[PDB]
Amino acid sequence: GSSGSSGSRLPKSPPYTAFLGNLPYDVTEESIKEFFRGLNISAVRLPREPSNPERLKGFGYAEFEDLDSLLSALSLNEESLGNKRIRVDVADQAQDKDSGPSSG
């Protein structure tokens, strides 16, 4: 047996960040572009392990401009990418700013 429950609330306000899971080891930057082909992407987020930069972390995120982009992304929650299947869910708008000194 296995429970089942899900229901996220897309960010009514942009930008629209998409969350991907169960990504392969071949998933490259170009793969994300083609995966979301047709939609409007502003940038691709691909975090790498804090130790092995050559290896992917495990999750992928992409920035969108139009709302339709995110909607279509959810349809790729099953779409088999390469040799494995990935899931698409609504990602929380997690932002962070920093600052630095300066002399001279």
Domain count, the chain: 1
**How far apart are alpha carbons 21 and 93 in whole angstroms?**
17
Expt. technique: NMR
CATH number, domain of 19, equals: 3.30.70.330
Q: 3-class DSSP state for residue 44?
A: strand
Number of H helices, E strands in the chain: 2, 6
Asked, for residue 85, whether it belongs to a domain, the answer is yes
**How far apart are alpha carbons 53 and 51 in whole angstroms?**
6
Whether the Cβ atoms of residue 62 and residue 74 lie closer than 8 Å to each other:
no
Look-up of token digits 């691709």? 44
Write out the residue range of the structural domain in which residue 27 sits.
14-91
Asked, for residue 28, whether it belongs to a domain, the answer is yes
